[PDB]
Amino acid sequence: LVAAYPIVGVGMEKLIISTNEHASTDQGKTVSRATTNSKTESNTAGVSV
Amino acid sequence: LVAAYPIVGVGMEKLIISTNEHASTDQGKTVSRATTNSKTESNTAGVSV
């Protein structure tokens, strides 16, 4: 008169999350050297009284 | 005379969207030092009356 029957169900214990990023670090160094030359030429003229 | 027959259908409750982008941020520093060592040389000549 009674029935043969299962009843199941779940229950959560814990929930874990996780993120999604993208990190990076950069480091650099710079070395440089230069040189310069020049040759100029000029003229002047004037009058006083 | 009648027939055994199911009639089903759906019904909407809510709708969710979610977009897609690519955001980024950067902060940087910079430090340097330069030197210079130089030598100059000139000549002059002139006539007055």
- Placement of tokens 């050297």 in the chain: A33
Instruction: Please state how this structure was obtained.
Output: cryo-EM
- Whether A30 contacts B32, CB under 8 Å: yes
What's the helix, strand, coil split of chain A in %, to 5? 0, 0, 100
The token pair at A48 is 């006083």
What's the helix, strand, coil split of chain B in %, to 5? 0, 0, 100
**CA angle (A38, A42, A45) in 5-degree steps:** 170
- Whether A43 contacts B45, CB under 8 Å: no
With CA atoms as reference, report the closest residue to B32 among A31, A26, A33: A31
Q: What is the resolution of this structure in A?
A: 4.5
With CA atoms as reference, report the closest residue to B34 among A22, A45, A34: A34
- Whether A44 contacts B46, CB under 8 Å: yes
